[PDB]
Amino acid sequence: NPNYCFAGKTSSISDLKEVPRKNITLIRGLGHGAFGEVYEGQVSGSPLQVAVKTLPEVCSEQDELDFLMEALIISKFNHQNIVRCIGVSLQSLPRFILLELMAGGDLKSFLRETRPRPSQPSSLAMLDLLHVARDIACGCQYLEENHFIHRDIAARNCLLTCPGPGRVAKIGDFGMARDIYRAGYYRKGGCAMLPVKWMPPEAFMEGIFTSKTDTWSFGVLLWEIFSLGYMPYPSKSNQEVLEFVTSGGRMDPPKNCPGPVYRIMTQCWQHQPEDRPNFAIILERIEYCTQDPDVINTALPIE
């Protein structure tokens, strides 16, 4: 089996908790992707509710190895703000990875669906946004401290435990990091698939990735959060953004975005990586924003 190393420990398939296929029931599809399905499931021998990620049976050996590595990567993290791997069912087909069920869904969809609307809702506030930001920043700090570069921080890759009050946001997708870990580069993708709009100059120009490249991405995620799920650089294509960003162009504040929050974004988007804050500092700054009554009492725009 292909190995995986994290935080000074090497692991393989045999260290994943295999759960008997007989113990797993699929309840409903949760909006499948183009490669692999995701289901709400239940594990019961007081049953454990889970997300079930599947591997298409029609796939290459490379795809299978990639699937195994995703399981390994996620299983070796230990943090509140990173989705848990409950186990795997690799000894039957189709292969399954069992994940913490994130009933609030992905953060981009959540923001879009829950953004104040001139009708029945308007139950989301600045504090909810700051809490999601802090949650993900905590996860990012953990990755930074463990020398793990995510490479693809973006709202689509963050998940919510539930839609209501008490939601916790967590990093839930590690496909890019997995791809680079296995191949050393984006072998499966190409220019059109790269998350250009989330990448700093040294990443898209030189292919240099560090924790400061996650800092930049996190700045874009912050804009996604505070814009309530808008696509970054809304009027621009990937190449236009590449040109815009390299020449010093940055996004304007999202509508109604408090100054102190936008300032965090602009700090994350410093041209020179050494000038960008690490995640400890980002966390401190988010927490300070959360302390400011003028920040948290700011109304979100109604569509």
GROMACS .gro file of N, CA and C in nm, residues 150-257:
model
  324
  150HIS      N    1  -0.266   2.348   0.238
  150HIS     CA    2  -0.391   2.300   0.181
  150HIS      C    3  -0.399   2.315   0.027
  151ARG      N    4  -0.356   2.432  -0.023
  151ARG     CA    5  -0.352   2.466  -0.166
  151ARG      C    6  -0.486   2.502  -0.229
  152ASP      N    7  -0.596   2.485  -0.157
  152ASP     CA    8  -0.729   2.504  -0.217
  152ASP      C    9  -0.830   2.551  -0.112
  153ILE      N   10  -0.790   2.648  -0.031
  153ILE     CA   11  -0.884   2.705   0.064
  153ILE      C   12  -0.985   2.789  -0.015
  154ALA      N   13  -1.113   2.761   0.003
  154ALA     CA   14  -1.223   2.823  -0.072
  154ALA      C   15  -1.352   2.778  -0.008
  155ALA      N   16  -1.457   2.858  -0.021
  155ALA     CA   17  -1.583   2.830   0.048
  155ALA      C   18  -1.642   2.694   0.010
  156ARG      N   19  -1.626   2.653  -0.117
  156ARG     CA   20  -1.677   2.523  -0.166
  156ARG      C   21  -1.617   2.404  -0.090
  157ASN      N   22  -1.499   2.425  -0.030
  157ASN     CA   23  -1.426   2.319   0.038
  157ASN      C   24  -1.445   2.320   0.190
  158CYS      N   25  -1.526   2.414   0.237
  158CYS     CA   26  -1.562   2.422   0.378
  158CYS      C   27  -1.707   2.373   0.396
  159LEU      N   28  -1.734   2.311   0.511
  159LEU     CA   29  -1.863   2.250   0.538
  159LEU      C   30  -1.914   2.296   0.674
  160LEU      N   31  -2.045   2.284   0.694
  160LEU     CA   32  -2.108   2.329   0.817
  160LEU      C   33  -2.174   2.210   0.883
  161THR      N   34  -2.159   2.199   1.016
  161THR     CA   35  -2.217   2.087   1.090
  161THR      C   36  -2.370   2.085   1.082
  162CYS      N   37  -2.428   2.205   1.076
  162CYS     CA   38  -2.573   2.220   1.072
  162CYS      C   39  -2.607   2.358   1.014
  163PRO      N   40  -2.732   2.377   0.970
  163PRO     CA   41  -2.765   2.509   0.914
  163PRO      C   42  -2.794   2.616   1.019
  164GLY      N   43  -2.842   2.574   1.136
  164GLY     CA   44  -2.881   2.668   1.241
  164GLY      C   45  -2.770   2.719   1.331
  165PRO      N   46  -2.808   2.802   1.430
  165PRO     CA   47  -2.727   2.845   1.543
  165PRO      C   48  -2.645   2.730   1.600
  166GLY      N   49  -2.522   2.756   1.641
  166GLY     CA   50  -2.436   2.648   1.688
  166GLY      C   51  -2.363   2.573   1.576
  167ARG      N   52  -2.382   2.615   1.451
  167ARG     CA   53  -2.306   2.556   1.340
  167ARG      C   54  -2.157   2.572   1.365
  168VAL      N   55  -2.082   2.471   1.325
  168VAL     CA   56  -1.936   2.479   1.324
  168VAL      C   57  -1.887   2.459   1.180
  169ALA      N   58  -1.803   2.551   1.134
  169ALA     CA   59  -1.746   2.537   0.998
  169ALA      C   60  -1.618   2.457   1.007
  170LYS      N   61  -1.593   2.370   0.909
  170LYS     CA   62  -1.476   2.282   0.904
  170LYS      C   63  -1.426   2.269   0.762
  171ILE      N   64  -1.295   2.250   0.749
  171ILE     CA   65  -1.236   2.222   0.620
  171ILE      C   66  -1.271   2.077   0.588
  172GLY      N   67  -1.330   2.054   0.472
  172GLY     CA   68  -1.386   1.923   0.441
  172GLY      C   69  -1.340   1.857   0.312
  173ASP      N   70  -1.256   1.927   0.236
  173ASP     CA   71  -1.204   1.875   0.110
  173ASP      C   72  -1.053   1.893   0.106
  174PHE      N   73  -0.982   1.787   0.071
  174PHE     CA   74  -0.836   1.788   0.063
  174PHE      C   75  -0.785   1.728  -0.068
  175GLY      N   76  -0.869   1.734  -0.171
  175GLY     CA   77  -0.839   1.676  -0.302
  175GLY      C   78  -0.714   1.734  -0.367
  176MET      N   79  -0.700   1.867  -0.362
  176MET     CA   80  -0.581   1.927  -0.423
  176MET      C   81  -0.453   1.885  -0.351
  177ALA      N   82  -0.455   1.892  -0.218
  177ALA     CA   83  -0.337   1.855  -0.141
  177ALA      C   84  -0.304   1.709  -0.170
  178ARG      N   85  -0.408   1.626  -0.179
  178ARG     CA   86  -0.389   1.485  -0.212
  178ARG      C   87  -0.320   1.468  -0.349
  179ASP      N   88  -0.371   1.539  -0.449
  179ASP     CA   89  -0.317   1.535  -0.585
  179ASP      C   90  -0.167   1.567  -0.589
  180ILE      N   91  -0.129   1.675  -0.521
  180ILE     CA   92   0.011   1.716  -0.517
  180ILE      C   93   0.095   1.617  -0.436
  181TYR      N   94   0.039   1.564  -0.328
  181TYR     CA   95   0.110   1.465  -0.248
  181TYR      C   96   0.146   1.342  -0.332
  182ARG      N   97   0.052   1.298  -0.415
  182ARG     CA   98   0.072   1.177  -0.495
  182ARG      C   99   0.160   1.203  -0.618
  183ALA      N  100   0.133   1.311  -0.690
  183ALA     CA  101   0.197   1.336  -0.819
  183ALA      C  102   0.313   1.435  -0.815
  184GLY      N  103   0.319   1.519  -0.713
  184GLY     CA  104   0.416   1.629  -0.709
  184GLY      C  105   0.372   1.752  -0.788
  185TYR      N  106   0.264   1.737  -0.864
  185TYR     CA  107   0.201   1.847  -0.937
  185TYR      C  108   0.057   1.811  -0.972
  186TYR      N  109  -0.015   1.906  -1.032
  186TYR     CA  110  -0.156   1.889  -1.065
  186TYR      C  111  -0.173   1.804  -1.192
  187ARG      N  112  -0.124   1.680  -1.186
  187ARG     CA  113  -0.124   1.588  -1.300
  187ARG      C  114  -0.264   1.560  -1.359
  188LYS      N  115  -0.364   1.552  -1.272
  188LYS     CA  116  -0.500   1.518  -1.311
  188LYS      C  117  -0.575   1.636  -1.373
  189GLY      N  118  -0.528   1.757  -1.343
  189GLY     CA  119  -0.600   1.878  -1.382
  189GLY      C  120  -0.541   1.946  -1.503
  190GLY      N  121  -0.518   2.076  -1.488
  190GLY     CA  122  -0.464   2.160  -1.594
  190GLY      C  123  -0.495   2.303  -1.557
  191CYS      N  124  -0.457   2.396  -1.644
  191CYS     CA  125  -0.476   2.539  -1.618
  191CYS      C  126  -0.622   2.573  -1.586
  192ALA      N  127  -0.714   2.520  -1.668
  192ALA     CA  128  -0.857   2.551  -1.654
  192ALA      C  129  -0.920   2.501  -1.523
  193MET      N  130  -0.856   2.402  -1.461
  193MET     CA  131  -0.908   2.348  -1.336
  193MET      C  132  -0.843   2.409  -1.211
  194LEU      N  133  -0.734   2.484  -1.229
  194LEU     CA  134  -0.663   2.544  -1.115
  194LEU      C  135  -0.750   2.653  -1.053
  195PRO      N  136  -0.754   2.660  -0.919
  195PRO     CA  137  -0.835   2.764  -0.855
  195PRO      C  138  -0.760   2.898  -0.854
  196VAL      N  139  -0.733   2.948  -0.975
  196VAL     CA  140  -0.660   3.073  -1.001
  196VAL      C  141  -0.704   3.191  -0.912
  197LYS      N  142  -0.835   3.206  -0.897
  197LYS     CA  143  -0.895   3.318  -0.824
  197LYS      C  144  -0.865   3.316  -0.674
  198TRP      N  145  -0.815   3.202  -0.627
  198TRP     CA  146  -0.777   3.186  -0.486
  198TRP      C  147  -0.625   3.185  -0.466
  199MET      N  148  -0.547   3.205  -0.574
  199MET     CA  149  -0.403   3.185  -0.567
  199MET      C  150  -0.322   3.314  -0.572
  200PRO      N  151  -0.216   3.321  -0.489
  200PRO     CA  152  -0.128   3.438  -0.490
  200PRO      C  153  -0.031   3.434  -0.610
  201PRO      N  154   0.033   3.547  -0.642
  201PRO     CA  155   0.125   3.554  -0.757
  201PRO      C  156   0.234   3.449  -0.759
  202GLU      N  157   0.301   3.424  -0.648
  202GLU     CA  158   0.411   3.329  -0.652
  202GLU      C  159   0.361   3.186  -0.680
  203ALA      N  160   0.235   3.159  -0.649
  203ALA     CA  161   0.176   3.028  -0.676
  203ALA      C  162   0.145   3.013  -0.825
  204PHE      N  163   0.070   3.107  -0.881
  204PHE     CA  164   0.034   3.092  -1.022
  204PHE      C  165   0.149   3.122  -1.120
  205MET      N  166   0.245   3.207  -1.080
  205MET     CA  167   0.361   3.238  -1.164
  205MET      C  168   0.475   3.138  -1.152
  206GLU      N  169   0.513   3.106  -1.028
  206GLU     CA  170   0.634   3.026  -1.003
  206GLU      C  171   0.606   2.885  -0.954
  207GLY      N  172   0.480   2.855  -0.924
  207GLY     CA  173   0.444   2.729  -0.861
  207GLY      C  174   0.504   2.712  -0.723
  208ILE      N  175   0.518   2.822  -0.651
  208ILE     CA  176   0.569   2.817  -0.514
  208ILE      C  177   0.450   2.816  -0.420
  209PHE      N  178   0.443   2.715  -0.333
  209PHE     CA  179   0.337   2.703  -0.235
  209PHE      C  180   0.399   2.691  -0.098
  210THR      N  181   0.344   2.769  -0.005
  210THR     CA  182   0.385   2.771   0.134
  210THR      C  183   0.258   2.798   0.214
  211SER      N  184   0.269   2.802   0.346
  211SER     CA  185   0.155   2.840   0.427
  211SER      C  186   0.108   2.981   0.394
  212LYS      N  187   0.197   3.066   0.341
  212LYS     CA  188   0.152   3.201   0.305
  212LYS      C  189   0.068   3.197   0.179
  213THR      N  190   0.077   3.090   0.102
  213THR     CA  191  -0.014   3.080  -0.011
  213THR      C  192  -0.156   3.043   0.040
  214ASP      N  193  -0.165   2.966   0.149
  214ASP     CA  194  -0.296   2.943   0.215
  214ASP      C  195  -0.351   3.073   0.277
  215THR      N  196  -0.262   3.158   0.328
  215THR     CA  197  -0.303   3.288   0.381
  215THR      C  198  -0.375   3.368   0.274
  216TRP      N  199  -0.316   3.375   0.155
  216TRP     CA  200  -0.379   3.445   0.045
  216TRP      C  201  -0.517   3.388   0.015
  217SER      N  202  -0.524   3.256  -0.002
  217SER     CA  203  -0.651   3.190  -0.029
  217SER      C  204  -0.754   3.221   0.079
  218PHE      N  205  -0.709   3.223   0.204
  218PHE     CA  206  -0.799   3.252   0.314
  218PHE      C  207  -0.858   3.392   0.302
  219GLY      N  208  -0.777   3.487   0.256
  219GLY     CA  209  -0.828   3.623   0.227
  219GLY      C  210  -0.941   3.620   0.126
  220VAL      N  211  -0.926   3.539   0.021
  220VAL     CA  212  -1.032   3.525  -0.079
  220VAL      C  213  -1.155   3.459  -0.017
  221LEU      N  214  -1.134   3.355   0.064
  221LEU     CA  215  -1.244   3.290   0.138
  221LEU      C  216  -1.319   3.392   0.223
  222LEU      N  217  -1.244   3.480   0.289
  222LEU     CA  218  -1.309   3.586   0.370
  222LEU      C  219  -1.401   3.673   0.285
  223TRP      N  220  -1.354   3.710   0.166
  223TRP     CA  221  -1.435   3.784   0.071
  223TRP      C  222  -1.559   3.702   0.030
  224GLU      N  223  -1.540   3.574   0.006
  224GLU     CA  224  -1.654   3.487  -0.026
  224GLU      C  225  -1.757   3.488   0.086
  225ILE      N  226  -1.709   3.479   0.210
  225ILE     CA  227  -1.795   3.475   0.328
  225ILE      C  228  -1.872   3.606   0.340
  226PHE      N  229  -1.800   3.717   0.333
  226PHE     CA  230  -1.863   3.846   0.359
  226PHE      C  231  -1.941   3.902   0.242
  227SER      N  232  -1.917   3.847   0.124
  227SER     CA  233  -2.003   3.875   0.008
  227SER      C  234  -2.127   3.786   0.006
  228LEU      N  235  -2.137   3.694   0.104
  228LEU     CA  236  -2.247   3.598   0.114
  228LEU      C  237  -2.251   3.501  -0.006
  229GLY      N  238  -2.133   3.454  -0.046
  229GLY     CA  239  -2.124   3.347  -0.145
  229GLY      C  240  -2.110   3.388  -0.291
  230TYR      N  241  -2.072   3.513  -0.315
  230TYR     CA  242  -2.035   3.556  -0.450
  230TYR      C  243  -1.907   3.488  -0.498
  231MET      N  244  -1.898   3.466  -0.629
  231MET     CA  245  -1.773   3.424  -0.689
  231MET      C  246  -1.672   3.540  -0.677
  232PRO      N  247  -1.548   3.510  -0.634
  232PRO     CA  248  -1.443   3.615  -0.630
  232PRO      C  249  -1.420   3.679  -0.767
  233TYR      N  250  -1.382   3.808  -0.767
  233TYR     CA  251  -1.356   3.885  -0.891
  233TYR      C  252  -1.471   3.865  -0.991
  234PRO      N  253  -1.593   3.897  -0.948
  234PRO     CA  254  -1.715   3.857  -1.021
  234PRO      C  255  -1.716   3.889  -1.172
  235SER      N  256  -1.663   4.004  -1.210
  235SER     CA  257  -1.669   4.043  -1.352
  235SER      C  258  -1.553   3.988  -1.434
  236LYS      N  259  -1.467   3.907  -1.373
  236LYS     CA  260  -1.341   3.869  -1.438
  236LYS      C  261  -1.324   3.719  -1.460
  237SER      N  262  -1.262   3.685  -1.572
  237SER     CA  263  -1.216   3.549  -1.599
  237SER      C  264  -1.087   3.519  -1.521
  238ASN      N  265  -1.047   3.392  -1.521
  238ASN     CA  266  -0.923   3.350  -1.456
  238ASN      C  267  -0.802   3.427  -1.508
  239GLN      N  268  -0.788   3.436  -1.640
  239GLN     CA  269  -0.673   3.508  -1.694
  239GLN      C  270  -0.677   3.656  -1.659
  240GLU      N  271  -0.795   3.716  -1.663
  240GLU     CA  272  -0.811   3.856  -1.626
  240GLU      C  273  -0.770   3.878  -1.481
  241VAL      N  274  -0.806   3.784  -1.394
  241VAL     CA  275  -0.767   3.791  -1.253
  241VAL      C  276  -0.616   3.779  -1.240
  242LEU      N  277  -0.557   3.684  -1.314
  242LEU     CA  278  -0.412   3.665  -1.313
  242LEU      C  279  -0.341   3.796  -1.344
  243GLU      N  280  -0.385   3.862  -1.450
  243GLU     CA  281  -0.326   3.989  -1.490
  243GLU      C  282  -0.352   4.100  -1.388
  244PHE      N  283  -0.477   4.107  -1.342
  244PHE     CA  284  -0.524   4.207  -1.245
  244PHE      C  285  -0.442   4.195  -1.116
  245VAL      N  286  -0.435   4.074  -1.060
  245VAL     CA  287  -0.363   4.048  -0.935
  245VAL      C  288  -0.212   4.072  -0.946
  246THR      N  289  -0.149   4.025  -1.054
  246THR     CA  290  -0.005   4.043  -1.067
  246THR      C  291   0.034   4.189  -1.073
  247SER      N  292  -0.055   4.271  -1.131
  247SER     CA  293  -0.033   4.415  -1.146
  247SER      C  294  -0.073   4.494  -1.021
  248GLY      N  295  -0.116   4.424  -0.915
  248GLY     CA  296  -0.151   4.488  -0.786
  248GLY      C  297  -0.299   4.509  -0.757
  249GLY      N  298  -0.384   4.470  -0.852
  249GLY     CA  299  -0.529   4.482  -0.838
  249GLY      C  300  -0.579   4.390  -0.728
  250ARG      N  301  -0.672   4.441  -0.646
  250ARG     CA  302  -0.739   4.361  -0.542
  250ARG      C  303  -0.887   4.386  -0.547
  251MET      N  304  -0.964   4.290  -0.497
  251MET     CA  305  -1.107   4.308  -0.485
  251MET      C  306  -1.143   4.425  -0.394
  252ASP      N  307  -1.253   4.493  -0.427
  252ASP     CA  308  -1.315   4.592  -0.339
  252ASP      C  309  -1.381   4.522  -0.221
  253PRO      N  310  -1.417   4.596  -0.115
  253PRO     CA  311  -1.492   4.531  -0.007
  253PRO      C  312  -1.626   4.475  -0.056
  254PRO      N  313  -1.670   4.361   0.002
  254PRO     CA  314  -1.805   4.313  -0.023
  254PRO      C  315  -1.904   4.418   0.028
  255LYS      N  316  -2.026   4.417  -0.025
  255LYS     CA  317  -2.129   4.511   0.019
  255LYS      C  318  -2.148   4.504   0.172
  256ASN      N  319  -2.142   4.622   0.236
  256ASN     CA  320  -2.161   4.640   0.381
  256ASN      C  321  -2.045   4.586   0.466
  257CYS      N  322  -1.937   4.541   0.402
  257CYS     CA  323  -1.828   4.478   0.476
  257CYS      C  324  -1.763   4.578   0.570
   0.00000   0.00000   0.00000
